[PDB]
Amino acid sequence: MDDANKIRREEVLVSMCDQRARMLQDQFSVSVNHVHALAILVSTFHYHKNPSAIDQETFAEYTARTAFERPLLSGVAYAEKVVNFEREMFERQHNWVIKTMDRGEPSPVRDEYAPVIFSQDSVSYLESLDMMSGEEDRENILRARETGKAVLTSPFRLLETHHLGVVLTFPVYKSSLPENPTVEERIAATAGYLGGAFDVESLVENLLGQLAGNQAIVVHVYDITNASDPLVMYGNEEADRSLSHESKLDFGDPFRKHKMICRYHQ
Ligand X SMILES: CC(C)=CCNc1ncnc2[nH]cnc12
Integer angstrom CA distances of residue 262 from 13, 18, 20, 169:
7, 9, 10, 29
Gap between the Cα atoms of 88 and 131, Å rounded:
18
Of these, 159, 191, 233, 239, which contacts ligand X (CB under 6 A)?
A: 159
Nearer to ligand X, 131 or 142 (CB): 131
Least Å from the CB of residue 166 to its own copies? 22
For the residues of 168-194, what is the DSSP string, one character each? EEEEEE-TTPPSS--HHHHHHTEEEEE
Measured between alpha carbons, how far is 248 from 227 in angstroms, rounded to an integer? Answer: 15
For residues 114 and 218, which CB has a smaller minimum distance to ligand X in the complex? 114
Whether residue 159 contacts residue 146, with contact meaning beta carbons closer than 8 Å, is answered with no
Q: Which of residues 87-126 bind ligand X (CB under 6 A)?
A: 114, 116, 123, 126
Broken C–N links (> 2.5 Å) in the chain, after residues: 236
The least distance separating ligand X from the CB of residue 51, rounded to whole angstroms, comes to 23
Q: Give the one residue of 107, 113, 130, 134 binding ligand X; rule: CB under 6 A.
A: 134
> Is 43 near ligand X (CB under 6 A)?
no
From the list ligand X, its own copies, none, pick the one residue 262 interacts with, judged by a Cβ distance below 5 to 8 Å according to partner type: none
Are 191 and 47 spatial neighbours (Cβ–Cβ below 8 Å)? yes
* Range 200-219, binding its own copies (CB under 8 A): none
The DSSP 8-state label assigned to residue 226 in this structure reads S
Helix (H) or strand (E) holding 202: helix 200-209
Of 117, 197, 261, 262, the one binding ligand X (CB under 6 A) is 197
Candidates 137, 201, 223, 253; binder of ligand X (CB under 6 A) is 137
Residue 168's Cβ-side half-sphere holds a number of Cα atoms within 13 Å equal to 27
Q: Specify the DSSP element, H or E, that contains 166.
A: strand 164-173
Taking the least distance from each CB to ligand X, the nearer of 154 and 244 is: 154
Among 15, 19, 33, 176, binds its own copies (CB under 8 A): 33
Partner whose footprint covers residue 193, from ligand X, its own copies, none (CB < 5 to 8 Å by kind): ligand X
How far apart, in whole angstroms, are the C-alpha atoms of residue 39 and residue 62? 13
Helix (H, G, I), strand (E, B) or coil at 178: coil
Largest CA distance in the chain: 74
By rule CB under 6 A, what count of residues binds ligand X?
A: 18
- In the list its own copies, ligand X, none, the entry touching 197 (Cβ below 5 to 8 angstroms by class) is ligand X
Residues that bind its own copies (CB under 8 A): 30, 33-34, 36-37, 40-41, 43-45, 48-49, 53-54, 58, 61-62, 65-66, 69
Residues that bind ligand X (CB under 6 A): 75, 77, 79, 114, 116, 123, 126, 131, 134, 137, 141, 158-159, 167, 169, 193, 195, 197
